[PDB]
Write an enzyme that holds these catalytic residues in place. Structure first.
Site, PDB file in Angstrom:
ATOM      1  N   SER A 112      -6.998   3.767   1.539  1.00  0.00           N
ATOM      2  CA  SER A 112      -6.214   2.705   0.910  1.00  0.00           C
ATOM      3  C   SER A 112      -7.064   1.802   0.032  1.00  0.00           C
ATOM      4  O   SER A 112      -6.847   0.590  -0.032  1.00  0.00           O
ATOM      5  CB  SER A 112      -5.508   1.867   1.981  1.00  0.00           C
ATOM      6  OG  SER A 112      -4.340   1.258   1.466  1.00  0.00           O
ATOM      7  N   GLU A 126      -3.508  -4.214  -8.215  1.00  0.00           N
ATOM      8  CA  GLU A 126      -4.140  -4.707  -6.989  1.00  0.00           C
ATOM      9  C   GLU A 126      -5.004  -5.929  -7.310  1.00  0.00           C
ATOM     10  O   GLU A 126      -5.678  -5.965  -8.345  1.00  0.00           O
ATOM     11  CB  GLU A 126      -5.028  -3.625  -6.362  1.00  0.00           C
ATOM     12  CG  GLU A 126      -4.288  -2.409  -5.851  1.00  0.00           C
ATOM     13  CD  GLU A 126      -3.436  -2.697  -4.629  1.00  0.00           C
ATOM     14  OE1 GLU A 126      -3.595  -3.778  -4.023  1.00  0.00           O
ATOM     15  OE2 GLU A 126      -2.612  -1.827  -4.263  1.00  0.00           O
ATOM     16  N   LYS A 172       1.246   7.341   4.944  1.00  0.00           N
ATOM     17  CA  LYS A 172       0.568   6.318   4.157  1.00  0.00           C
ATOM     18  C   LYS A 172       0.990   4.969   4.707  1.00  0.00           C
ATOM     19  O   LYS A 172       2.172   4.638   4.727  1.00  0.00           O
ATOM     20  CB  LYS A 172       0.927   6.386   2.674  1.00  0.00           C
ATOM     21  CG  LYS A 172       0.135   5.372   1.841  1.00  0.00           C
ATOM     22  CD  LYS A 172      -1.366   5.679   1.876  1.00  0.00           C
ATOM     23  CE  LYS A 172      -2.210   4.531   1.324  1.00  0.00           C
ATOM     24  NZ  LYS A 172      -2.273   3.364   2.254  1.00  0.00           N
ATOM     25  N   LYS A 198       1.164   3.496  -3.203  1.00  0.00           N
ATOM     26  CA  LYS A 198       0.106   4.378  -3.694  1.00  0.00           C
ATOM     27  C   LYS A 198       0.515   5.857  -3.659  1.00  0.00           C
ATOM     28  O   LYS A 198      -0.084   6.690  -4.336  1.00  0.00           O
ATOM     29  CB  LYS A 198      -1.176   4.158  -2.880  1.00  0.00           C
ATOM     30  CG  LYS A 198      -1.851   2.820  -3.189  1.00  0.00           C
ATOM     31  CD  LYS A 198      -2.845   2.400  -2.112  1.00  0.00           C
ATOM     32  CE  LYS A 198      -3.349   0.986  -2.363  1.00  0.00           C
ATOM     33  NZ  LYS A 198      -4.091   0.444  -1.196  1.00  0.00           N
ATOM     34  N   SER A 218       0.742  -1.264   0.000  1.00  0.00           N
ATOM     35  CA  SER A 218       0.000   0.000   0.000  1.00  0.00           C
ATOM     36  C   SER A 218       0.776   1.322   0.000  1.00  0.00           C
ATOM     37  O   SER A 218       0.253   2.333  -0.457  1.00  0.00           O
ATOM     38  CB  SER A 218      -1.008   0.011   1.154  1.00  0.00           C
ATOM     39  OG  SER A 218      -2.000  -0.991   0.964  1.00  0.00           O
ATOM     40  N   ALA A 246      -0.333  -2.803   4.779  1.00  0.00           N
ATOM     41  CA  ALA A 246      -0.465  -4.034   5.533  1.00  0.00           C
ATOM     42  C   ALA A 246      -0.721  -5.134   4.532  1.00  0.00           C
ATOM     43  O   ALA A 246      -1.765  -5.160   3.886  1.00  0.00           O
ATOM     44  CB  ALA A 246      -1.621  -3.933   6.507  1.00  0.00           C
TER      45      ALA A 246
HETATM   46  C1  IM2 Z   1      -1.922  -2.237   1.545  1.00  0.00           C
HETATM   47  O1  IM2 Z   1      -0.842  -2.668   1.916  1.00  0.00           O
HETATM   48  C2  IM2 Z   1      -3.196  -3.075   1.748  1.00  0.00           C
HETATM   49  C3  IM2 Z   1      -3.686  -3.714   0.397  1.00  0.00           C
HETATM   50  C4  IM2 Z   1      -4.957  -4.607   0.435  1.00  0.00           C
HETATM   51  O2  IM2 Z   1      -4.016  -2.659  -0.535  1.00  0.00           O
HETATM   52  C5  IM2 Z   1      -4.251  -2.157   2.407  1.00  0.00           C
HETATM   53  C6  IM2 Z   1      -5.195  -2.852   3.430  1.00  0.00           C
HETATM   54  C7  IM2 Z   1      -5.145  -1.932   4.604  1.00  0.00           C
HETATM   55  S1  IM2 Z   1      -6.203  -2.215   6.050  1.00  0.00           S
HETATM   56  C8  IM2 Z   1      -4.930  -2.964   7.134  1.00  0.00           C
HETATM   57  C9  IM2 Z   1      -5.235  -2.860   8.673  1.00  0.00           C
HETATM   58  N1  IM2 Z   1      -6.502  -2.168   9.006  1.00  0.00           N
HETATM   59  C10 IM2 Z   1      -7.340  -2.717   9.983  1.00  0.00           C
HETATM   60  N2  IM2 Z   1      -7.156  -3.810  10.679  1.00  0.00           N
HETATM   61  C11 IM2 Z   1      -4.242  -0.921   4.413  1.00  0.00           C
HETATM   62  C12 IM2 Z   1      -3.886   0.195   5.339  1.00  0.00           C
HETATM   63  O3  IM2 Z   1      -3.618   1.430   4.914  1.00  0.00           O
HETATM   64  O4  IM2 Z   1      -3.807  -0.007   6.544  1.00  0.00           O
HETATM   65  N3  IM2 Z   1      -3.646  -1.039   3.165  1.00  0.00           N
END
Ligand code: IM2
Length: 262
Positions: A104, A140, A208, A47, A44, A211
């Site tokens: 995100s 994605e 930014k 982005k 992420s 995860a």
């Molecule tokens: C980016 O690394 C991922 C990918 C699916 O685009 C997203 C998902 C999330 S939500 C992660 C944790 N939130 C709640 N438990 C993010 C983010 O910005 O946290 N990016």
């Protein structure tokens, strides 16, 4: 400094993963590095470079941010917090950029990629600003696999710190574009438990998060400590298990360790 080093190393060893840190103090250009030249999956956090490429275009293409793109149920991916609210309707590039950066949104990310002509164009943009480490290879959600040893969709903490600085404080983008990126980063709604958590509450931050697989928990930010010169910080973290849980708390501790007393 060597105390900051021993603390980071201890933090990594206790976490059981691989930590990457790069902090740039714009006051004297000093740096705090930890595995700063090693590659990590950006997921992420990629982005930011992507949104910045769209902003770059707006410097020569008047009103491009007001251009609309249609959102269809077929465009939806595994994470559409905002885009799913527009199925069958249109979103401007600005709205898509905001959804991409602040929530995100995966579908918004793919919309921007389609507009730009693919991830190879984001990589090219990075090279145009002097970043020879960054590389975006997939769309994605495939770009989040974060497989150990895989170089696809990765970068180094230091290279991403330098580019974030160039983009938010330097000259990689013009004034209006630079201001819009900073505003978007400050409006992020997903960083509450990462870098921000390890900083005094009244400090101003733009960031930014990221995860993805292998418990990879990332975050890149620009920090304004009261009235002192801003700090550019990158905290990247990945683990041995594909299905590992995210450690936003490790990024908070890395943040506190390198910014305390700043
Ligand atoms: C980016 O690394 C991922 C990918 C699916 O685009 C997203 C998902 C999330 S939500 C992660 C944790 N939130 C709640 N438990 C993010 C983010 O910005 O946290 N990016």
């Amino acid at each position: 400094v060597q105390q900051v080093q021993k603390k980071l190393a201890a933090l990594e060893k206790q976490s059981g993963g691989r930590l990457g840190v790069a902090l740039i103090n714009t006051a004297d250009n000093s740096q705090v590095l930890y595995r700063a030249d090693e590659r990590f999956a950006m997921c992420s956090t990629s982005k930011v470079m992507t949104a910045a490429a769209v902003l770059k275009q707006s410097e020569t293409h008047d009103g491009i941010l007001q251009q609309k793109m249609t959102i269809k149920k077929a465009d939806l991916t595994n994470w559409n917090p905002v885009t799913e609210k527009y199925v069958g309707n249109t979103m401007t590039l600005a709205e898509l950029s905001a959804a991409t950066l602040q929530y995100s949104d995966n579908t918004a990310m793919n919309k921007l990629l389609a507009h730009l002509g693919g991830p190879g164009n984001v990589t090219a943009f990075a090279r145009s600003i002097g970043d020879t480490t960054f590389r975006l290879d997939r769309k994605e959600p495939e770009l989040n696999t974060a497989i150990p040893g895989d170089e696809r969709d990765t970068t180094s903490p230091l290279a991403m710190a330098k580019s974030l600085r160039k983009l938010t404080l330097g000259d990689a983008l013009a004034g209006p574009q630079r201001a819009q990126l900073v505003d978007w980063l400050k409006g992020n709604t997903t960083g509450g438990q990462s870098i921000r958590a390890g900083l005094p509450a009244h400090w101003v931050v733009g960031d930014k998060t990221g995860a993805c697989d292998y418990g990879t928990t990332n975050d890149i930010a620009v920090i304004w400590p009261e009235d002192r010169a801003p700090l550019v910080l990158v905290t990247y973290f990945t683990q041995p298990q594909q299905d590992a849980k995210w450690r936003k708390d490790v990024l908070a501790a890395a943040a506190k360790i390198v910014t305390e007393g700043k």
